[PDB]
Structure 1
Amino acid sequence: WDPASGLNMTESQKGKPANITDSLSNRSLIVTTILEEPYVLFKKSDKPLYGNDRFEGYCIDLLRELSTILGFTYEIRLVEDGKYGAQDDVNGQWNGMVRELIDHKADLAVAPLAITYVREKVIDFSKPFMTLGISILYRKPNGTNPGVFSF
């Protein structure tokens, strides 16, 4: 002690006799997803609401319903490269989410991943939660200017 200084305690908090790392505690699953309407969207808020709370959509609600029914803690991390992932040229690398899954920077891929042949050899998928295909847009039939002999 010193009246100019104060309490300068020399018990400066060295290494504690309790030091245990985690491998199964939660590990906080780093769920890689991409931002596409209406699957994953940002919240429409004004205050700085962040963490996992800033996301919104259908595909977020799937991850929340899995967290209750399987008991884990999800942590949404958006992919740095905005692609899903595709087989490259002579390079032969993956680019986007499927690259994050191989690199094990992503324990999960809760997103619109189209289950296909070149992704199944390289990563694995759960069974489909939504089935789709290729369909047609067209004009809805209008007020029908009928021709001119419509009488």
Structure 2
Amino acid sequence: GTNRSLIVTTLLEEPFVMFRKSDRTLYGNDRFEGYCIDLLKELAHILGFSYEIRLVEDGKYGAQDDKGQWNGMVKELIDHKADLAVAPLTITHVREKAIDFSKPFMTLGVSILYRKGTPIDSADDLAKQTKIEYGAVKDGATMTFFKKSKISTFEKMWAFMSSKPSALVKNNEEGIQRTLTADYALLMESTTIEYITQRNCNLTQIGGLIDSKGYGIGTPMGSPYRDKITIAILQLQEEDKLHIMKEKWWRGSGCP
């Protein structure tokens, strides 16, 4: 109880959480690597706790349906089926009504991922047409941002996204594949766009950031672990350790 391993919910999302490469069949925690796994390992070392990582069954981050029921990792935390959600889980006002978060470990904002070609320059350019289809990950923070916005441009965008079946994708990977195979722009969080555009040289960020917010480790509301994790994060940041950790996982061969 005071000594038990913490249950960690997560999902696969490069370069935050990935299946590490091996010839063996792997099991348990050893299956996973990435920026969020490195962060978890360092926190566990600093704070003297152990854990068991489990993939969220529905593969979702989490949003509310019309009855107010949650899904994804957010629901796992609400139900106390996990102690921590270690993932690029966006800290948002709607989620803070239901779960808690550590202090942010990374800053990001919503922006646009699109193929180099048609020289659109902002969300305003997308909103005023439909030839270039656009969308977001279903039941994530970006979708919820658009759904809740009262800014005219973004209201128009939500009207389109929410009317078009194909527009909301299962996960980043599906969305990225869609930008590569169709005339489709993905509304995506900016540090992920940074990672993707360094590796897929035909993709680019369109325009700037629409907002500026954070990823945090999610916990059930009132968790006894959340504060020590926050203080440890703060201290890692004071020493630039998270910047270094980001460089490790974002580092790579650029583009021509």
- Alignment TM-score > 0.5, same fold: yes
Letter in 1 for 2:50: T
What stretches of structure 2 of length at least 5 have no aligned partner? 118-256
More helix by share: 2
CA contact (8 A) 1:87 1:118 kept: no
1:79 aligns with 2:56: yes
- The CA deviation string for residues 76-119 of structure 1, in whole angstroms up to 9 with x for no partner, is 011011110001112x2110101110111100011111111110
Instruction: Give aligned-pair identity as a percent.
Output: 82
For these two proteins, the number of residue pairs brought into alignment is 117
Shift of 1:45: 0.6
Structure 1 window deviating more from structure 2 (130-139 vs 69-78): it is: 130-139
Q: Which residue of 1 aligns with 2:95?
A: 119
Provide the aligned C-alpha RMSD in A: 1.7
Structure 1 window deviating more from structure 2 (72-81 vs 131-140): it is: 131-140
State the TM-score, normalizing by the size of structure 2. Answer: 0.43
Which gives a bigger RCO, structure 1 or 2 (Cα 8 Å, sep 6+)?
A: 2
> Which is higher, the Rg of structure 1 or of structure 2?
1
Shift of 1:136: 4.7
Q: Which residue of 1 aligns with 2:40?
A: 63
State the TM-score, normalizing by the size of structure 1. Answer: 0.72
Letter in 1 for 2:56: V
1:100 aligns with 2:76: yes
What stretches of structure 1 of length at least 5 have no aligned partner? 1-22, 141-151
Runs of 4+ in 1 over 3 A off after TM superposition: 135-140
The SS at the match of 1:66 is helix
Letter in 1 for 2:41: R
1:33 aligns with 2:13: no
More strand by share: 2
